[PDB]
Design a protein around this ligand. Structure first.
Ligand SMILES: Nc1nc2c(ncn2[C@@H]2O[C@H](COP(=O)(O)OP(=O)(O)O)[C@@H](O)[C@H]2O)c(=O)[nH]1
Ligand SMILES: Nc1nc2c(ncn2[C@@H]2O[C@H](COP(=O)(O)OP(=O)(O)O)[C@@H](O)[C@H]2O)c(=O)[nH]1
Ligand SMILES: [Mg+2]
Ligand SMILES: [Mg+2]
Lengths: 177, 177
């Protein structure tokens, strides 16, 4: 709601910022966006089979799309992305190896070289959900000795961890550029 | 887009109406919605797990959501539904039986009792895509001895068939109550 509006209020200014939130399908990306209550989640299809949800807050645009189904059109988007958030279904032990692939494939893009990474280890409320330490390992985030990263455990449905992780991210951008 | 807006025009009274477009996931509902160019597709999540896309023209709300995976909140939506569009992935021969039960199930509900059913047999551009003739059977549309109904073969991505099926529906609604 507002606690999130406040967060991003310090990042306001004549400049179009982009915060990419990608992850596999059903990771909790649309739920996290609805939870921020920064505005209307509007869907558009840039290209057939390319669904993009966006919440435009002010100069800050929240762009979301599923991953693993790369793509050219993506680069255009990358050309504005200050920060990338990657949400993982901690309870989906089966597709984290994929999450890692795409993640590594995203970090490996030239325009996203100077982008702050925030990994949301969502669905923490599920009984056999990996913890933020398991996910950091499986994702091999400890080898990303090069970029400003961070992992916050969450539950998009109850909503906790979203503020704490977005607080970090907000701080980072505030002195990113 | 504009050809589509004029279609519903006559129906522009002050009356709050709703056209419910449903079917299994991946059927082509979001693509159909985007093709109409009647407005922005906003995703809301009334209850956890329940994602609804809505486009609003004037006194018209196109409410979309995936089925097959009733509920008390739908019945509330049902209590205002004039038209019911049911889109099927004509090429997904496997779950056609599932889209059949979900359809039948939806028609069982009382507020829907006076809803006009338009069936879009989508993805018609694919080689294996069942045709309206086979769909009309696999869904038992002929069993509907008590309601208005029409099946229109479409291809959402190119837009083929959208106007035809939607021109029919308009009439049904133009002389409803
Ligand atoms: N248990 C649990 N379920 C969640 C959580 N976040 C999202 N979900 C559920 O996972 C499904 C996928 O979520 P969704 O937001 O549509 O995913 P997206 O495909 O990544 O955009 C939905 O049915 C959610 O309501 C969470 O933290 N915990
Ligand atoms: N080949 C083909 N694909 C279609 C057609 N309509 C939709 N799709 C594709 O089917 C996938 C699912 O469609 P979508 O609009 O996302 O469906 P929804 O899950 O019902 O909202 C997307 O890749 C669409 O581009 C069609 O007529 N032909
Ligand atoms: Mg989604
Ligand atoms: Mg959809």
């Amino acid at each position: 709601g507002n606690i999130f509006a406040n967060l991003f209020k310090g990042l306001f200014g004549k400049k179009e910022m982009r915060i990419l939130m990608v992850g596999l399908d059903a990771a909790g990306k649309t739920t996290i966006l609805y939870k921020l209550k920064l505005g209307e989640i509007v869907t558009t299809i840039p290209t057939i089979g390319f669904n993009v949800e966006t919440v435009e807050y002010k100069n800050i645009s929240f762009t979301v799309w599923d991953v693993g189904g790369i793509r050219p059109l993506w680069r255009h988007y990358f050309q504005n992305t200050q920060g990338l958030i990657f949400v993982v279904d901690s309870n989906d032990r089966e597709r984290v190896n994929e999450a890692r692939e795409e993640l590594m494939r995203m970090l490996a893009e030239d325009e996203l070289r100077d982008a702050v990474l925030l990994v949301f280890a969502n669905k923490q409320d599920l009984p056999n959900a990996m913890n933020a330490a398991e996910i950091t390992d499986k994702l091999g985030l400890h080898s990303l000795r090069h970029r400003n990263w961070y992992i916050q455990a969450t539950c998009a449905t109850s909503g906790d961890g979203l503020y704490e992780g977005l607080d970090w991210l907000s701080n980072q951008l505030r002195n990113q550029k």
